[PDB]
C-alpha cells in the first residue's frame, strides 16, 4: 500500500503542475515496474515536460499491460487527459468513459466528454453528457445554456426553447448586473430558435414577434433585435411596418448598404427607378456624407445626362480631396455597367483634368492622373495607363500608391521581375510600412525570386499561410522550368558538360517538386488547426453567455475546407498528384515526391475534407471528374459531366472537351482540357497546339505567357 500512497502524492503533484517532482516518486515506484497507472502517469508527466517520444512509449506500454480492458478509474482518467493532449479525441472519449464505467465519481468527466464529443461532431452523445453534467449541477446557468444549445444542435428545437424558458423562471428575480448580458443573449437566442421553428407560419411568426417585443427592454443587442423584427414583418407581409424598422436601422448605421436595399423592397419600389430616385434624394438629406444615397442611383439611372451629372457629383469631390480609392469606389460600375458608365466617366475626368494647374492644384492634379491611369488600365489601354501614372510620378515621386499602380501595369504586361522591382522602390519610401512589405514579398514570389522574398520579409524577423501558398506556387513554376531545361537537354570532351548538367537539373527538379508539395501540404495543416481551435469554445461560450456566436462558430468550422486559400492549395496541389499518377506508367519533401499512392495522398491530405463540406452549388465538377477519372470510378465521371452541363449548359467548350475524354474510355479552355488528355484521346496534338496559340492573340501578355509556359509546357 506504500506504492499507492507514493502514486497518489505523484497524482497530486501532477495536478499542481509540479511535473518533475511527480516524476521522481514514479521513477521510484517503477524502479521497484508492473505498475500500470504509474506507467500511465509517468507517460503524462513526460508529455507535460516535453519528453513526447518517451511519453508515447510509456503510454503504449501501460495500454498493452491492460488486456482486461478493466483498468482503474484513475488510470483511465490519466489516459483520457493524455489522449486529449495529443489530440486523439476519439481515444480520449473511450478512456474518459471507461473511467466512469469503472466507477469514477468525478462528474467533471462529463463536461470534458461534452467538449470532446462536440469537437468530433458527435452531438448526439455530447447532448447525453450535457444532460448528465446539468443534472449534477442544476445551479449553474452555463449548464442550462449548454444543454439548450446541445438540444438545438440535435434538432430538438422545442426542447431547447423549453430549457431556456426553465432557467428564465429560476432567474426571474436574481439577475444581478453582472448577469444582465448573458440574460440578454439567452433571450435573443431563444427568439432565434422560435424564429426558425416558425418558418412561414403566420400565427407562429406573430408569436415570435410578440416575444421579441416583450424581451426588448432586456435585450442589449439592438441591431440584432431590429434586424429580426424587420425580417418578421416582411414574412408577415407587413411591409410598411418593416420599412419603419429598416429606416431605424439605417439611422443607426447609414453606412451599411444592406439596409437601403431592404428598404426599397419593403416600400415595393425595388423596380421603380423614379420612386427610388425620390427615396435616395430624401435619404441624401438625412445622410449627406454617406455613400449609399449617393452611390445606389449610379447603379440604376438610365438617362445619360442624369447619370453623367450624378457620376460627376460622386467622383469629382473625391478627386478634389485627393482620395486614392476614388477609382476603386466606382469600379463595380465599370464591372457591371461598363458600356454605359465608362465613356461618361472618361469625359468627366478628362474634362476635370483639363482645368487643373499642376502647381496651384497639385493634390487634385496627381490624384486625377492616378484615377485616369486605372481607368485606362481597366480598359486595357496600356500606353495611356503608363502615361497618366508617369505624370503623377513625375510630379510627386514620394507617394507609394503610384508605385503600386505602376507595378500592376507591368505585371499585366507579364514582366514579373520588373513589377516586383517597382514595388520595391515604393517600399524604400517607408521601410516600416508592413502592408507594402507584404505586397513586395508576394510580387517577388510571383517572379519566382524566393531568396529576395524571404530577405524582404526577414526585415520583420513565423510562416504565414498566404506566404506559404505563394511560395508553393513559385516552387512549382521553378519545377516546371527545370524540367523543361532538362528535356531540352536531351564530342566526348564536352560530353562531360551535358553529363554533369543533366545530373544538376535532375536534382533541382526533384528539389523544387518536393518543395512545392511540402509547401502545399502545410495549408491543410493550418486549416486543421483552425478546426481544432474550436475546442475551448464549446465550454467557454457557454460560460461567457454567447450561444448565438457559438453557433456561428460551428457553421464557420463546417466551412473551413471550402475556404479560398484551402481550395487554392487543393487545386494547385492536384496538378502534382494527378501528374505523378499518370507519369506512373524530409526537409525537401522527397518522401512526398516518391509516393506509391498519389491519389490516396491527395484525397487524404486535401480532397476528402473539402468534399464533405462543399455545397453542391459551389462544387468544382471538373476537379471531381479529373479526380474520379484516375480513381477508376467512371460512374462518378458521368455524374460530374451531367451535373456540370446542368449548370453551364452544353455549349461550353470545356463541356464538349470533357464528354469526349469519357466517351473514349476559338474557346481557349476547352481546347486546353483536350490537350492535357492527348495521350489517352487521339487528337491532332500538334494541330491542337497550333489552335491553342491562335486563340491566345486577344488576351493580355501575362495570360499569353503563363499559358505558353505552364499550361502547354
Amino acid at each position: 500500500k506504500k506504492e499507492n500512497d507514493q502514486f497518489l502524492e505523484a497524482l497530486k503533484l501532477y495536478e499542481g503542475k509540479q511535473y518533475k517532482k511527480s516524476l521522481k516518486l514514479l521513477d521510484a515506484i517503477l524502479k521497484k515496474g508492473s505498475h500500470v497507472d504509474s506507467l500511465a502517469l509517468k507517460g503524462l508527466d513526460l508529455y507535460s515536460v516535453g519528453e513526447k517520444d518517451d511519453a508515447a512509449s510509456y503510454v503504449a506500454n501501460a495500454i498493452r499491460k491492460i488486456e482486461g480492458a478493466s483498468a482503474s478509474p484513475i488510470c483511465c482518467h490519466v489516459l483520457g487527459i493524455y489522449m486529449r493532449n495529443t489530440k486523439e479525441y476519439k481515444e480520449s472519449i473511450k478512456w474518459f468513459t471507461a473511467a466512469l464505467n469503472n466507477g469514477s465519481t468525478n462528474k467533471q468527466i462529463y463536461r470534458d466528454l461534452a467538449t470532446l464529443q462536440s469537437q468530433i461532431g458527435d452531438f448526439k452523445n455530447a447532448l447525453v453528457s450535457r444532460k448528465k453534467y446539468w443534472e449534477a449541477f442544476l445551479g449553474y446557468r452555463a449548464n442550462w445554456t449548454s444543454l439548450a444549445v446541445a438540444q438545438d444542435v440535435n434538432g430538438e428545437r422545442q426542447q431547447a426553447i423549453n430549457t431556456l424558458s426553465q432557467f428564465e423562471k429560476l432567474a426571474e428575480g436574481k439577475i444581478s448586473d453582472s448577469e444582465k448580458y448573458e440574460h440578454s443573449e439567452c433571450l435573443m437566442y431563444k427568439n432565434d430558435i422560435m424564429y426558425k421553428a416558425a418558418s412561414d407560419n403566420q400565427d407562429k411568426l406573430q408569436n415570435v414577434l410578440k416575444h421579441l417585443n416583450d424581451i426588448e427592454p432586456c435585450v442589449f443587442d439592438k441591431f440584432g433585435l431590429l434586424e429580426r423584427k424587420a425580417t418578421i414583418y416582411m414574412k408577415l407581409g407587413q411591409l410598411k411596418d418593416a420599412s419603419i424598422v429598416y429606416r431605424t436601422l439605417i439611422k443607426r448605421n447609414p453606412d451599411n448598404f444592406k439596409y437601403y436595399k431592404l428598404l426599397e423592397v419593403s416600400l415595393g419600389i425595388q423596380g421603380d427607378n423614379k420612386l427610388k430616385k425620390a427615396l435616395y434624394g430624401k435619404l441624401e438629406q438625412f445622410y449627406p456624407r454617406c455613400e449609399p444615397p449617393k452611390f445606389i442611383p449610379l447603379t440604376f439611372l438610365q438617362d445619360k445626362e442624369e447619370l453623367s451629372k450624378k457620376l460627376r457629383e460622386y467622383v469629382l469631390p473625391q478627386l478634389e480631396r485627393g482620395v486614392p480609392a476614388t477609382f476603386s469606389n466606382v469600379k463595380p460600375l465599370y464591372q457591371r455597367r461598363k458600356s454605359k458608365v465608362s465613356p461618361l466617366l472618361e469625359k468627366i475626368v478628362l474634362d476635370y483634368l483639363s482645368g487643373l494647374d499642376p502647381t496651384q492644384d497639385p493634390i487634385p492634379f496627381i490624384w486625377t492622373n492616378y484615377y485616369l491611369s486605372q481607368h485606362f488600365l481597366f480598359l486595357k489601354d496600356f500606353p495611356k495607363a503608363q502615361e497618366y501614372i508617369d505624370a503623377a510620378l513625375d510630379h510627386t515621386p514620394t507617394l507609394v500608391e503610384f508605385y503600386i499602380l505602376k507595378a500592376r501595369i507591368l505585371k499585366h504586361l507579364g514582366l514579373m521581375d520588373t513589377a516586383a522591382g517597382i514595388l520595391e522602390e515604393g517600399r524604400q519610401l517607408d521601410l516600416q510600412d508592413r502592408f507594402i512589405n507584404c505586397k513586395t514579398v508576394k510580387y517577388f514570389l510571383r517572379a519566382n525570386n524566393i531568396d529576395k522574398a524571404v530577405e524582404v520579409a526577414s526585415l520583420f524577423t513565423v510562416e504565414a499561410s498566404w506566404f506559404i501558398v505563394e511560395q508553393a506556387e513559385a516552387y512549382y513554376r521553378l519545377y516546371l522550368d527545370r524540367k523543361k531545361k532538362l528535356d531540352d537537354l536531351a564530342e566526348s570532351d564536352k560530353s562531360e558538360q551535358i553529363a554533369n548538367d543533366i545530373k544538376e537539373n535532375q536534382w533541382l527538379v526533384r528539389k523544387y517538386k518536393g518543395l512545392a508539395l511540402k509547401r502545399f501540404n502545410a495549408i491543410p495543416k493550418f486549416y486543421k488547426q483552425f478546426e481544432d481551435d474550436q475546442l475551448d469554445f464549446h465550454s467557454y461560450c457557454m460560460r461567457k453567455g454567447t450561444p448565438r456566436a457559438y453557433l456561428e462558430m460551428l457553421e464557420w468550422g463546417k466551412a473551413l475546407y471550402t475556404k479560398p486559400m484551402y481550395v487554392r492549395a487543393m487545386k494547385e496541389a492536384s496538378k502534382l498528384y494527378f501528374q505523378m499518377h499518370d507519369d506512373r506508367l524530409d526537409v525537401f519533401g522527397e518522401k512526398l515526391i516518391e509516393t506509391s499512392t498519389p491519389m490516396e495522398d491527395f484525397a487524404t491530405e486535401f480532397y476528402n475534407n473539402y468534399s464533405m463540406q462543399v455545397r453542391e452549388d459551389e462544387r468544382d465538377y471538373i476537379l471531381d471528374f479529373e479526380f474520379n477519372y484516375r480513381i477508376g470510378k467512371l460512374a462518378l465521371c458521368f455524374a460530374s459531366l451531367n451535373k456540370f452541363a446542368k449548370r453551364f449548359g452544353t455549349t461550353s467548350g470545356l463541356f464538349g472537351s470533357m464528354a469526349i475524354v469519357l466517351l473514349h474510355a476559338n474557346d481557349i479552355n476547352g481546347l486546353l482540357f483536350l490537350y492535357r488528355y492527348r495521350d489517352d484521346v487521339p487528337i491532332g496534338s500538334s494541330n491542337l497546339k497550333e489552335m491553342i496559340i491562335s486563340s491566345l492573340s486577344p488576351l493580355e501578355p501575362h495570360s499569353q505567357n503563363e499559358i505558353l509556359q505552364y499550361y502547354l509546357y
Binding site: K222, F223, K274, L279, F435, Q529
Partner: protein, 213 residues
C-alpha cells in the same frame, strides 16, 4: 464603394491575412476568435462591395468584397480588476492606408463606441496613442472628443512617449445621427416619398426629375 457593418467570425481569416503580425498565425486566429466570440456585438469591419445593377487574394470575404479596415473591441475581463466599473478597450483599429480620406477610421470608431455603451453599458473607454502620429491624435482628441489626460513618458516597447486618453461614454451623445452633418433627420414616422405628389408650383419646379412622361 465602402460598406460598414458588424464583424463576424467569417471575417477573421481575412483580418488575419490583411497584416503581418509578430505572433504566430494560430495564436492570432485564437486571439481573433476569443474577441469575436466573447464580444460579438462590439467589433466592426469596412469592406468593398459590389452591387446589382485567379490567384484568390486572402482578404476577400466574397467576390467584390474585400476587407479594408476593422475595429476589434473588448470589454474589461482582467481578473485583477473584477471590482472596477465596466470599461471598453480598443484592441485594434486598422485601416488600409490606401483607403484613407474616406472617414473609415472615424465611422468604425463611432460604431464601436456606441456599441460599447449600448450593449455593455461601458462607462468609459481608455487608450494610448504614439506621440508620433498626429493623425491618430487628431482622430481621437478632435474628431472623437477623447480627453487628453496626460503624457505617459517612454510608454511604448521602443521607448516612445504616449498620450493617455479617455472618453466617458454617454448614449445620447454617441448616437450616430449626431454626426451625419458637418440638420434634417428621419423622424422614423413620416412618409419618405411624400414629396412626389405635392401640387405647389415651387414643388413642381424643384421636384422636376421625379415627374415622368
Amino acid at each position: 464603394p465602402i460598406n460598414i457593418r458588424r464583424a463576424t467570425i467569417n471575417d477573421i481569416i481575412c483580418m488575419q491575412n490583411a497584416n503581418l503580425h509578430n505572433l504566430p498565425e494560430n495564436y492570432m486566429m485564437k486571439y481573433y476568435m476569443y474577441h469575436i466570440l466573447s464580444w460579438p456585438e462590439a467589433s466592426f469591419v469596412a469592406t468593398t462591395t459590389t452591387l446589382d445593377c485567379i490567384k484568390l487574394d486572402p482578404t476577400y470575404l466574397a467576390p467584390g468584397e474585400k476587407l479594408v479596415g476593422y475595429v476589434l473591441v473588448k470589454m474589461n475581463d482582467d481578473p485583477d480588476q473584477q471590482n472596477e466599473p465596466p470599461n471598453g478597450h480598443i484592441t485594434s483599429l486598422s485601416v488600409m492606408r490606401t483607403y484613407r480620406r474616406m472617414g473609415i477610421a472615424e465611422n468604425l470608431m463611432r460604431q464601436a463606441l456606441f456599441a460599447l455603451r449600448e450593449v455593455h453599458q461601458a462607462e468609459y473607454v481608455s487608450l494610448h496613442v504614439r506621440q508620433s502620429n498626429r493623425a491618430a491624435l487628431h482622430l481621437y482628441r478632435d474628431t472623437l472628443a477623447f480627453e487628453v489626460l496626460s503624457i505617459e513618458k517612454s510608454y511604448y516597447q521602443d521607448g516612445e512617449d504616449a498620450y493617455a486618453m479617455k472618453k466617458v461614454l454617454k448614449l445620447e451623445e454617441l448616437q450616430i445621427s449626431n454626426f451625419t452633418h458637418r440638420k434634417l433627420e428621419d423622424d422614423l414616422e413620416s412618409d419618405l416619398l411624400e414629396d412626389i405628389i405635392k401640387q405647389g408650383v415651387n414643388d413642381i419646379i424643384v421636384e422636376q426629375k421625379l415627374i415622368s412622361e
